[PDB]
Subunit: 321 residues, 3 copies
């Protein structure tokens, strides 16, 4: 009863829990057949993907490139020195050329509005590879990982400790739909987007789930099942970016932070990780799901591509969510 074929994945805001669940289900299916059973499934044979990156990457680049190729399609890697975007060409014109030459586009851009324009003009699916506002494909990998750990998701309390960035916005746009609670801590002045937050409340209300916003790392960690953080220091090289080193004091996740969380707690980090966000004790702790989380970036982006470009239907039995 889920029809995803042909849709864009710009943000989890537009997907119902039933649809996001279909994608994780497909993720499990694909992982089972390929990784466990060892089968070869050329589901994307004859297809191509335009990967436009305005920023560095490895996790997204690698997972998306090997993933698309693993199903028989051809991934096409493009950067700012390749595209004419911004320099020698409009956006409406680029969306049209791409729409006749690729079957889908995955774009990592600075502005979310650019993805909106792109989708408005393109006639092939547009997938958000990360933007200022959201990073939905990261959340898909996170949930599948949590699912693989706890056997279900409903009821879990996610504790966010870090900046009010794209990861949190994507978590806010989806946690409630899985019946999960969200307790988030961000320094004053680094709150998540006001309109995003306003929508997370409504989701929390419609699904009977908790939504706690605080500036206290420990208040957020308190009672949580999953501790989640992410690099908060800006790449903006500057001895004046100390503001973040000064505003984020007490945010480093350590065993102290875990002391106040649920006993069955696990840890998540989208990577790359630095020694500020979390220490090595928690990070390399057997409670850390960082690496299984990274690997799931591959299976989930594969699932996204398959469900937006094919009619393939899952073999595996629907997982317990």
């Amino acid at each position: 009863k889920v029809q995803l074929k042909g849709r864009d994945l710009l943000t989890l805001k537009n997907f119902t829990g039933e649809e996001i669940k279909y994608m994780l289900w497909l993720s499990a299916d694909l992982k089972f057949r390929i990784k466990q059973k060892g089968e070869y499934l050329p589901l994307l044979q004859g297809k191509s993907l335009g990967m436009i990156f305005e920023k560095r990457s490895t996790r997204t680049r690698l997972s998306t490139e090997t993933g698309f190729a693993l199903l028989g399609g051809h991934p096409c890697f493009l950067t700012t020195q390749d595209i004419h975007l911004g320099v020698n060409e409009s956006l409406t014109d680029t969306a049209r050329v791409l729409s006749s030459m690729a079957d889908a586009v995955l774009a990592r851009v600075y502005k979310q509005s650019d993805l909106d324009t792109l989708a408005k003009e393109a006639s092939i699916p547009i997938i958000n590879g990360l933007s200022d506002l959201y990073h939905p494909i990261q959340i898909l990998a996170d949930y599948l990982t949590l699912q693989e750990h706890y056997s279900s998701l409903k009821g879990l309390t996610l504790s966010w400790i870090g900046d009010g960035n794209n990861i949190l916005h994507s978590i806010m746009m989806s946690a409630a739909k899985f019946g999960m609670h969200l307790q988030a801590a961000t320094p004053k002045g680094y709150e998540p987007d006001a309109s995003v937050t306003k929508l997370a409340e409504q989701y929390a209300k419609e699904n009977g789930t908790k939504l706690l916003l605080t500036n206290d790392p420990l208040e957020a960690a308190h009672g949580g099942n999953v501790l989640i953080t992410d690099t908060w220091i800006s790449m903006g090289r500057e001895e004046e970016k100390k503001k973040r080193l000064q505003a984020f004091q007490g945010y480093q996740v350590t065993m102290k932070t875990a002391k106040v969380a649920a006993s069955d707690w696990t840890f998540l980090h989208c990577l790359p990780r630095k020694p500020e966000e979390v220490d090595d004790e928690v990070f390399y702790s057997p409670r850390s799901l960082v690496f299984p989380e990274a690997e799931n970036r591959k299976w989930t982006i594969m699932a996204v591509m398959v469900s937006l470009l094919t009619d393939y239907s899952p073999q595996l039995q629907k997982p317990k969510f």
Copy 2:
């Protein structure tokens, strides 16, 4: 009766109309079977292509990369930071290494002479991906597009309005062979190459077609079926490049320009397009074939590869030219 296998495509100058027609025919065939019938044809399975680019690109890069992969071959993208060409290695040595590692090379270079050297030494086909003198693969896409629009080509009058560049040279090297007339306008001092022009006259003479050279945009557009332009402003950043803004006054194609052309006129632009060459009224006009033109860059380069590397013969019935 057409044997193209193993030949280089450095310029349309060396191909007879019968041969260029074979390529467009193959272009139509491939487009029909893949785009319309949805078949998968691994005609280039086991083959690889070396794509050497000394300059940016998107149209050529994308079309060539997705096109080659769509037929089962592996496209290999190389730039100036990859090759050793110019910096740490000769040309005769590079042609030999490439000849043992790829099945063909597509090169976008600054000098046409470099392609000549390359071909002299390489023992695998060399395809011109654009050079100072010509851009034949662009014309293949143009003609197929015109063919798809008018149902035939013979008799059409092409009106060129712009610089005396590679596109025009390629048009000059091929229009007459299809029985098409050419009326071209270029500012004084920006005339097409003298030896190229001298050859276009001879072709015009051998095929009983018209060849008009003028410095008047309107005299060239007058009576034409297809209005064709192209970016004339140089990337050479300089407030002294105004010479082109001053020499090309009156060259912007607008509805005024169309007022004097045949009633069934269409418009072509190889892209990317800027607001100088043409306005939005003509450019996004329903007479503009810009996008179908861009898409055909894919089907035609595919046809080129297949005819130079395989023995594949067209299923589709030979088109009307």
Copy 3:
């Protein structure tokens, strides 16, 4: 009786002659079936390769990329602007992410220690694409070429004339295992690594082969069957790098150098070649195996991948070594 599957290829130091022979044998097999018989062998279908390059390349990039794709796998090209290595990420973390996303990694790094770390942490094969200490895949191509020329290797005397670099170290780590003699000349102060040399002596002793180290180009060439050189001028742009132009006087291989070598002598150069190491008379001489040597870079890296990632066993009859 040779089990290579799953092993790293960091240096020929850890492989027995029987194992290196298996790889050349597989190289011949693959070359025979694909190049001569024209078969298509998707031995690496469903596999991916992470190619991390910290330095330029063409020979390694091209051979490895077309080679991996020719067997049905997907080669993934990464550079310093792609990876986060060094800038935003540790090495232990990168080895783990790669280990879950690719089936093997080929790395061209500056430090050999980095490959050691990488292998320690990664759980997928690591292949040395060239480092400060060694360049084993280059030697595989050399030996196969010599094998194809002389019909056997045992007994040949290899004469090295150049710097005490990675190529020589790799030659030292393997020549004796094939029963070949090594006479090497390097300027004073440019001797090969002391510990590597110490091990080459032991190999020479265990296989009853000769190992001669001298600072005399002619003493090394004297009686040799294969003259081997390599670019000794440093890329370190500096009118003070003249030290190498001054220390390497008399090292240019010319017909004079060949005058004192065995009558059946051949010449090898890993490329790219400059006019300092060798002149055009020797380089383009019919005794030069430079190009067949370059081509064999493809067949040998293919053999490496197949033997480290599959259970494929050679069809061809074991060659005479």
